[PDB]
């Protein structure tokens, strides 16, 4: 984890919009740092910007086509409505390979997200009774 990545992650964590944009611009032309990097606990830039609900940072990081991965599940578990709206209209995992967006949304009684998901059309598989 280079220092040029520690500076970038710190800028994302505080909320310095101009600095994060400058780092992203200097990355696409010099290819120095890897935007898909992990900090010691394992977070990426997307997770850091979602954990603080920084909608401007989240929108910016989508305009540079970062890796999304299980970023929708994290927003659903954190119950961030704006982040879910953004992520919808666009290897180590923390979730079991059987958890889908609608299931994980239904575990949390959040009416807004559940309605937002079922408006797009989903389906939960009924298990055969015994």
């Amino acid at each position: 984890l280079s220092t040029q990545e520690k500076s970038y992650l710190s800028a994302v964590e505080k909320g310095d919009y101009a600095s994060v944009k400058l780092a992203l611009e200097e990355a696409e032309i010099y290819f120095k740092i890897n935007i898909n990097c992990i900090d010691p606990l394992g977070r990426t830039a997307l997770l850091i910007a979602i954990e603080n609900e920084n909608l401007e940072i989240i929108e910016l990081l989508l305009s540079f086509n970062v890796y999304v991965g299980d970023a929708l599940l994290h927003a659903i578990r954190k119950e961030v409505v704006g982040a879910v709206e953004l992520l919808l209209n666009h290897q180590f995992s923390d979730f079991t390979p059987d958890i889908t967006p609608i299931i994980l949304a239904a575990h949390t009684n959040n009416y807004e997200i559940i309605k937002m998901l079922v408006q797009k059309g989903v389906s939960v598989p009924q298990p055969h009774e015994v």
Partner: protein
């Protein structure tokens, strides 16, 4: 009680009674690495952000505003 009946030692009531490892350490170490990573991510990073608030948090949040105000006032003068 159950484990006492998993082996072929007694297997018979009293009336009628008278590398192979080094390869596996690879899989075991891979499994431990995944388990430790999951535990760190789940317990000591994702359940520390669910504690309560005290007076130190309030003083922190007040001092942030104080320093911001001082800096801006000095910047406009």
């Amino acid at each position: 009680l159950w484990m006492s009946y998993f082996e072929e030692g007694g297997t018979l009531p009293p009336p009628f009674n008278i590398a192979e490892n080094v390869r596996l350490n690879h899989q075991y170490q891979e499994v431990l690495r995944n388990l430790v990573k999951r535990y760190v991510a789940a317990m000591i990073r994702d359940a520390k952000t669910e504690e309560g608030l005290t007076e130190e948090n309030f003083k922190e949040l007040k001092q942030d505003i104080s320093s911001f105000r001082y800096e801006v006032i000095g910047m406009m003068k």
